[PDB]
Amino acid sequence: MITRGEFFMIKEMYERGMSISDIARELGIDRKTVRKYIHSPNPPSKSKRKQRKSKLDPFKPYLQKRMLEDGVFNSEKLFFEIRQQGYTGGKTILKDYMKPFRETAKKKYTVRYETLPGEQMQVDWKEVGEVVIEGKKVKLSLFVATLGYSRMKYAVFTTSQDQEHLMECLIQSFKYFGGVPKKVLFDNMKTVTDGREQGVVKWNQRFSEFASYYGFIPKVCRPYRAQTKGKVERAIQYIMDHFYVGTAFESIEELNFLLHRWLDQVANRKPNATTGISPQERWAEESLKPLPLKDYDTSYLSYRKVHWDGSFSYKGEQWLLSAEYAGKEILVKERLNGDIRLYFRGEEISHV
Amino acid sequence: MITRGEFFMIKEMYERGMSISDIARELGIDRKTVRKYIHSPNPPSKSKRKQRKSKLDPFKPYLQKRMLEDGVFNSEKLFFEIRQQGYTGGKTILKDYMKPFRETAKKKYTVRYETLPGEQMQVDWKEVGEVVIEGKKVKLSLFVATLGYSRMKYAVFTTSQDQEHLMECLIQSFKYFGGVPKKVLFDNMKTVTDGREQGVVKWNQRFSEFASYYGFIPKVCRPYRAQTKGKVERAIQYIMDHFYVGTAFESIEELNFLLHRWLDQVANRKPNATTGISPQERWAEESLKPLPLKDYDTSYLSYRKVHWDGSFSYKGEQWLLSAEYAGKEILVKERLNGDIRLYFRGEEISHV
Amino acid sequence: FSYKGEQWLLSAEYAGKEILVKERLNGDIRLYFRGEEISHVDQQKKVISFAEKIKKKQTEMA
Ligand SMILES: [Mg+2]
Ligand SMILES: [Mg+2]
Numbered sequence A, B: 001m002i003t004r005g006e007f008f009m010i011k012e013m014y015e016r017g018m019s020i021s022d023i024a025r026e027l028g029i030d031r032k033t034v035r036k037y038i039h040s041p042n043p044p045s046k047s048k049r050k051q052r053k054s055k056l057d058p059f060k061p062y063l064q065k066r067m068l069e070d071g072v073f074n075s076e077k078l079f080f081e082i083r084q085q086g087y088t089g090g091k092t093i094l095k096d097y098m099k100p101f102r103e104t105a106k107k108k109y110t111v112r113y114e115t116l117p118g119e120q121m122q123v124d125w126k127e128v129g130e131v132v133i134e135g136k137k138v139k140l141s142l143f144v145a146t147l148g149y150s151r152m153k154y155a156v157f158t159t160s161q162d163q164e165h166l167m168e169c170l171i172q173s174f175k176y177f178g179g180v181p182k183k184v185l186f187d188n189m190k191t192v193t194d195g196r197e198q199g200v201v202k203w204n205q206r207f208s209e210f211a212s213y214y215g216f217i218p219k220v221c222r223p224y225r226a227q228t229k230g231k232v233e234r235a236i237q238y239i240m241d242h243f244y245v246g247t248a249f250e251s252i253e254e255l256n257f258l259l260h261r262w263l264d265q266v267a268n269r270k271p272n273a274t275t276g277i278s279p280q281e282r283w284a285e286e287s288l289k290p291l292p293l294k295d296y297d298t299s300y301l302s303y304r305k306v307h308w309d310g311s312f313s314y315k316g317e318q319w320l321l322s323a324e325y326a327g328k329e330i331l332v333k334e335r336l337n338g339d340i341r342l343y344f345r346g347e348e349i350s351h352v
Numbered sequence C: 001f002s003y004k005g006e007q008w009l010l011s012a013e014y015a016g017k018e019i020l021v022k023e024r025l026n027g028d029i030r031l032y033f034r035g036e037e038i039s040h041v042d043q044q045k046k047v048i049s050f051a052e053k054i055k056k057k058q059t060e061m062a
Helices: A004-015 A020-027 A031-038 A060-070 A075-085 A092-098 A163-176 A205-214 A227-242 A252-267 A279-285 B004-015 B020-027 B031-038 B060-070 B075-085 B092-098 B163-176 B205-214 B227-242 B252-267 B279-285 C050-061
Strands: A121-133 A136-147 A153-158 A183-186 A193-197 A200-203 A217-220 A299-305 A329-335 A340-344 B121-133 B136-147 B153-158 B183-186 B193-197 B200-203 B217-220 B299-305 B329-335 B340-344 C020-023 C029-033
Touching: A004 A020, A004 A031, A020 A031, A060 A075, A060 A092, A075 A092, A121 A163, A121 A227, A136 A163, A136 A227, A153 A163, A153 A227, A153 A252, A163 A205, A200 A205, A205 A217, A227 A252, B004 B020, B004 B031, B020 B031, B060 B075, B060 B092, B075 B092, B121 B163, B121 B227, B136 B163, B136 B227, B153 B163, B153 B227, B153 B252, B163 B205, B200 B205, B205 B217, B227 B252
Parallel strands: A121 A183, A183 A217, B121 B183, B183 B217
Antiparallel strands: A121 A136, A136 A153, A193 A200, A299 A329, A329 A340, B121 B136, B136 B153, B193 B200, B299 B329, B329 B340, C020 C029
């Protein structure tokens, strides 16, 4: 088992012409050993041995059954049990054998990553809570979109977290940043996925079409791990401890106006604590893909029938449609702003 | 403002007979100052000055209103607001003024106390959960009583946390320890208190009578602070991670038998990690007050009426009472073990 | 904290921090924290349980 260096030295000194016996004398090795190593391929310094029997082998299946069906992980309890069965050794071997079965405590070290310019964006929601806006109880939610390289922040308040609202907020973010990223990171929302099909993710077909339309590649971090999108979560903490702490409002339009003004004043103006530069300069450094001229229409699409007289009803509303549109089927495109339009076989109805 | 030592030296050297001028020369003080201090009561080394005006005085009421009604504690937001009002200074003064109003983050240091022998005991409950025992869903609870000086542990399982069950478990603990403590520490349970009447505690009248009967003085730690009774909580963790982890059972009597055997085997036998001695030896060192001969009767007491024929019904049960006990009022003493006894004006009924 | 099977009680400032114990071959323990020197722990030949140390600190603070 002469080590790498010893074998190299033996072979080299032997090939140099030095006599073998005095080589052995110099290296303090037996002459037979040195001569055998002369005609050897490479330094031998490794011995392979397979596993061997231990004391806790007969009890091992029983302990495994205890762990995997009774959920017992108390080394003292298992030791006391098996001691009656016949075991006589200490607990160290038991702990060493049982350690792999124990759950892996979550780490505390946190890797840091710096995405390339115009290469990544992050999105998330924040359930603000229930408020009485204009005498109406609604569930307010905050949508936050954080750029990855410039740390920009766009935000907007909404009353619902429907796929339509998500897509519209993404449109607003893309317009705000003057382009679309090459990658957009969400969490595992059903408006973007439909579960992990054996490790792989199954994208919602409509959302996949939307992404292919705007060209941005979706990504999802992982189940029950929000660290991977720390930028946007920390931006949420920033906004909810700086803007929505004492600000008072009565209309969501007013709140959104105040939020945009606040962002453009301080949030996207104050230099970041890590990049140490105003986010707008980095934004100017960003290179996002151009937006399409026509935005992906995100509006509720329903089919309704006009009554005999010509009175058409949608939600708690009523219209008066010409007699030619009575008893037929029409399309009611409801934009998220409340602009309802009526269509009949492509044509647009001048609804009264 | 000559300090204590300087004044002492001046007075002493002057009274010794040393000339005053060379005293002043030696101590590097003016002759007038030294002479004035000669006839002085005590060393003058303190100057008292009252508060003075600052820059954030006019804004202080507004900031206080913001904090106390809008809940804003973001120094950046308040600074940005008041800067428009006219403030021109830095944020350090703002943070210093606003610090007292901020909530006091909980400490992490933990005082350690060692009660005197036979002087303190602690009690607590542990809601194990819901189990199907004998095809019946019951809410299992664990009652734990930990001695303070010997760290003994008594425990018992129960289906309810009623004042009657609490008192009976206390009786069992006192019998187990061979005596009653001089102090018993609970948490703020309504079976022992009725709320903090302006800081002071109002003891439940029945429980107060029970305590006065057994002579042990009750105590309650504080609202929302379980550290003060760490012994019993840690004993609960011990029992729920050592005994009730994999043990299987079908009857609560079996579970209690196993629990008592386990306690007397290991729990009250293994030396403690801090006292470093077997709890039973310290128990032998304990000096508890003697138990009363007759235990405080903890049994449901209800008054019922016997039907015309003589059929008396309690819960889903039926009896057959002699005709002389028909149409009258009787007492149904239900012991917690299920021993129902019938009483009629002190006499006991030989119910069939 | 702990040292060679004996548990010592420090003050509030030292809780949650790494101290350095230096023990001469003579047999005396000296606790150095953050370069400075902290109060001696009056090491005794007879081992005293953590409970007795808690009681002693309690009486001292009393
Ligand atoms: Mg989310
Ligand atoms: Mg409790």
